[PDB]
Amino acid sequence: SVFSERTEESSAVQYFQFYGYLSQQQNMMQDYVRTGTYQRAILQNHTDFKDKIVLDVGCGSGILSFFAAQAGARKIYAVEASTMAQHAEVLVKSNNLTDRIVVIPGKVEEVSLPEQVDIIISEPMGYMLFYERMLESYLHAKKYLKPSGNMFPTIGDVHLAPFTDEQLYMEQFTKANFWYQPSFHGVDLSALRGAAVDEYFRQPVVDTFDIRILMAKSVKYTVNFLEAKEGDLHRIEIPFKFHMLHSGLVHGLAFWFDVAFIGSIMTVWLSTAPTEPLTHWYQVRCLFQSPLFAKAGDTLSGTCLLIANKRQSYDISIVAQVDQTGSKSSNLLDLKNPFFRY
Amino acid sequence: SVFSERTEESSAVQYFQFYGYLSQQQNMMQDYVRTGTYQRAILQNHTDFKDKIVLDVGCGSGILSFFAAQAGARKIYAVEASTMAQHAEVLVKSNNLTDRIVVIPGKVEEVSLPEQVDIIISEPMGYMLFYERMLESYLHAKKYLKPSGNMFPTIGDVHLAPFTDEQLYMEQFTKANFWYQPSFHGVDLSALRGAAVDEYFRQPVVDTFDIRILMAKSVKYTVNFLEAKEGDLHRIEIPFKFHMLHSGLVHGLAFWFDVAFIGSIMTVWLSTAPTEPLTHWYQVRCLFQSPLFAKAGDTLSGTCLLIANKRQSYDISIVAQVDQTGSKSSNLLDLKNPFFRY
Ligand SMILES: Nc1ncnc2c1ncn2[C@@H]1O[C@H](CN(CCCNc2ccccn2)CC[C@H](N)C(=O)O)[C@@H](O)[C@H]1O
Ligand SMILES: Nc1ncnc2c1ncn2[C@@H]1O[C@H](CN(CCCNc2ccccn2)CC[C@H](N)C(=O)O)[C@@H](O)[C@H]1O
């Protein structure tokens, strides 16, 4: 299938094994901003669900399907590839909703549905939106969408902005410099120091931060889920040109995302911005191994390029330059191996 | 090979991927008890290495091979299956030891060595000794050992002892009781509460603890690596009969291990006991689903059975009984999915 072809089997088994556990579901369910905002988006847009046919892509425990049922959906196909499908089935029965919610075990790229749907609902967003490549599965599912069907969420905005955080920078640097030791119990480790540095700086940093570290207004990159195709997400090129508001060392770029549920009654936003209450997505920072000095009024331009790999992730290339001085930094990150700093 | 036959490929890819990272090596290297004890065992037993041929099974960064070289080894075959092999090669060159340390990329069950060796060195120990099944690879390597060759470690002692920890016990129910909610955003979750409880009780708990929780002297199970065969580790039956030193509720069994390097000059012990300074192995606790009351002077008997599986791990079965009252408990645990509580 389209899933097995883009996904090395060892990565797929690990991914679905992880989402099979109830403890993991509990952790996600306890994000009240996430769960409450989804419920509000669906219930306040009840006319988008009332007597409709719906597809829930990667339903997990089933909660979004339950919200669709509360909003009056006639039928909800709830697709789930992990063993969480069986637990969702238990909930559908114990909540007396077997007349409305039909769990379909398997990958959305592989199952067969009996009819086309009015609306697709999902939570495909990983860290910095793209982590884990579930957006592709969400877009793949549009093969089941009727003409003029809706998607919830409808659009995603990724935000990026340059930051200064000496302290985060020194922490990661200090760890790599363990390998600058000429006599670790008599052994010279220093030949591996560059490799060690590269490995640490390749890890995106998942945690939150004060907005005062941000040195320019964010640049926004939008994915319209109604219009994008799966293959659009294999290579994502995000140009940027920042007008620097503060002078200092730029240690990297910070990322967050918002999604909008554009319903008939209203648009509901779910934001993971650092100006908003914390979610289990936190925010993500990509460090530069060599920081860039810039003054307020300078332009910091470059490109953030995400290249999908078969480990169900992306290799991230970031090249940035201070236009006024020609100072450049170029950096590679492995979105599969984040540093969970919180 | 013997490795591929006992190990599902998806488990093997995940395992060697994990040991490929320098940060993981750094973590192990920074365990001073571990690294210092290995160095001391090798250097203080220099006559076991001086002008000898050695095999380092799973050499990682190469550190033990460097210690063998410091002790005078004539030649060291350093076998490693992860991409850490390439970093080891870099260190061998930068430490000017290419004439004495030969790095061999691959699994010890699959590579070919040109000659038999005087002594095998390794660090095959996982949590509770047996986690990750590397002891089998270590024993497999005795096909390369000369008659009367030595093994470093030599022997391993697994210790088990009953513990009381009411807060650890209750923590499982507190977490599972998230599911005991009749209207989580309108949804009755309660039907999943037993499944949640079951899931948490299958996870062995990796962390340390105060020795005051221990209710009896440990029972010891010894593997003599000079004498054991690979197949001895496929099914490990550990009977126990504890003479209780304290009255109270027994919530489960705690596990730790020691290994001894029995050299010609001296025996050096590496202990992960909770009476010793903490190592990166911590200790491990397996809960009983139902606690058992016992008085000081009673006997708590039963069996701990470890059954090797193709996920490169063990299913752990524990049955226990207070002889004087006939009160019995069991559990089944999955050593592949430990709870890292530290
Ligand atoms: N192709 C596929 N076919 C069928 N099923 C798929 C496919 N792909 C993934 N699945 C399942 O979709 C579920 C994913 N969840 C993950 C939630 C968002 N992800 C995050 C969030 C934060 C950080 C990182 N990641 C969606 C939310 C759902 N409403 C729920 O309640 O979980 C998991 O159970 C997955 O197994
Ligand atoms: N069949 C095999 N063929 C060839 N190579 C194998 C095989 N199997 C495993 N390897 C390698 O052995 C290395 C593992 N050891 C670390 C083991 C510790 N494990 C723990 C520790 C704590 C908790 C849990 N687990 C490195 C020690 C080395 N002396 C050094 O100091 O770096 C890793 O590089 C593995 O890839």
Author numbering:
A (entry chain C), B (entry chain A): 135 to 476
Tell me, in the authors' exact words, what the paper reports:
Protein arginine methyltransferases (PRMTs, E.C. 2.1.1.125) catalyse the transfer of methyl groups from S-adenosylmethionine (SAM) to arginine residues of target proteins, giving a pattern of nitrogen methylations dictated by enzyme type. Co-activator associated arginine methyltransferase (CARM1, or PRMT4) targets substrates that contain proline-rich sequences rather, than the GGRGG sequences favoured by PRMT1. Co-activation of gene transcription is effected by methylation of histone arginines: H4R3 by PRMT1; or H3R17 and H3R26 by CARM1, for example. Novel non-peptidic bisubstrate inhibitors and crystal structures of their complexes with CARM1 are reported here.
A difference in sequence at position CARM1 Asn-265, which corresponds to Tyr-160 in PRMT1 was identified by analysing structural alignments of PRMT1 and CARM1. We hypothesised that the residue in this position may affect the conformation of neighbouring glutamate Glu-266 (Glu-161 PRMT1), which is critical for orienting the substrate arginine residue for methylation and is in close proximity to the aromatic rings in compounds 9 and 10. The second mutation, CARM1 N265Y renders the substrate arginine-binding pocket more PRMT1-like. A modest decrease in the affinity of 8, 9 and SAH for CARM1 N265Y compared with WT was observed while the Kd increased substantially from 1.11 to 143 µM for inhibitor 10. These observations reinforce the notion that interactions between the aminopyridine and substrate binding channel are responsible for the preferential binding of 10 to CARM1 over PRMT1. To investigate the structural origin of this effect, CARM1 N265Y was co-crystallised with 10. As hypothesised the resulting structure revealed a conformational change in Glu-266, in which the glutamate adopts a conformation whereby the plane of the carboxylate group is almost parallel to the phenol side chain of Tyr-265. The effect of this mutation on the position of Glu-266 in the crystal structure of CARM1 N265Y is notable.
